[PDB]
Amino acid sequence: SVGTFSLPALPYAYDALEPSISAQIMELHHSKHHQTYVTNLNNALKTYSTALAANDVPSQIALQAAIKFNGGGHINHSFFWENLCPASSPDADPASAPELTAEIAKTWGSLDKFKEAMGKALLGIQGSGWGWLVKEGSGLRIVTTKDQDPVVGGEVPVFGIDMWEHAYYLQYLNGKAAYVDNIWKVINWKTAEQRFKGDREDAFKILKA
């Protein structure tokens, strides 16, 4: 059936990411923002089914913005919750991703240099957007996307970090740098390791729900 998406539950409690991410932000980010992206996606898919059947290409093009923005929001946030875990969990330990860290160290020199290069790209985003570590054929790359544009060009997304203001403003105010340093404590490196070992279809299996 067309447009039958639903909001998946979190793999953890709303306060499980504290003190890195407050329980209020996790509640608003998931139950409000992410829910809205899922809802408007279903409506857009149902409206597109009408235009596609009638061969109304002007209406299909006019609907592309709503599908890209809302579909990407559901895609990016579905990835986001999976690659986040409480700091106490062993998944937050970079040692749980031995093959990923080896390629990371070969590319940027070390894990600390990659976190510096990753952090630099996140703080350099002008406006709303995301920062991603992706997998291209042979090596790795740091890429940024604006608003809710997803990584659907062929690359294998390893993990992403939301730099939208709704993700940190209630706790860090304008201090986005403090939000980046603290989010490294809640990065699920086990999820990042698995996605790095699978192909594109494997990473996009989180979309089942």
DSSP-derived 3-state class of residue 179: helix
- Euclidean distance between the first and final Cα of the chain, in Å? 14
Of the pair 60, 194, the CB lying nearest its own copies is at: 60
Closest distance to its own copies from the beta carbon of 75 (Å): 7
Length of the chain as a residue count: 209
Q: Select 76 or 96, whichever has its Cβ closest to its own copies.
A: 76
166 is in an annotated binding site: yes
Chain-centroid distance, C-alpha 136: 17
Asked if 164 is part of the footprint of Mn ion (rule: CB under 5 A), the reply reads yes
Q: Supply 83's token pair.
A: 């690659």
Binding of its own copies by 41 (CB under 8 A): yes
Please report the DSSP string for 60-125 in residue order: HHHTHHHHHHHHHHHHHHHHHHHTB--TTSGGGSGGG-HHHHHHHHHHHSSHHHHHHHHHHHHHT-
Q: Does 26 bind its own copies (CB under 8 A)?
A: no
Position 49 contacts its own copies (CB under 8 A): yes
Both tokens assigned to 91: 């998944």
> Out of its own copies, Mn ion, none, which partner does residue 162 contact, by CB within 5 to 8 A per kind?
Mn ion
72 contributes a contact to Mn ion by CB under 5 A? no
* Interacting span for its own copies (CB under 8 A) from 11-19, 84-92, 122-130, 182-190: 122-130
Q: Tell me how far, at minimum, the Cβ of 71 lies from its own copies, in Å.
A: 4
**Dihedral (CA of 47, 48, 49, 53) sign:** positive
Instruction: Count CB atoms within 10 A of the CB of residue 107.
Output: 14
Residues that bind its own copies (CB under 8 A): 1-2, 4-5, 28, 32-33, 36, 41, 45, 48-49, 52-53, 55, 57-62, 64-65, 67-69, 71-72, 74-75, 107, 126-129, 138-139, 141, 146-148, 150, 152-153, 164-166, 169-170, 173-174, 204, 207
Residues that bind Mn ion (CB under 5 A): 162, 164
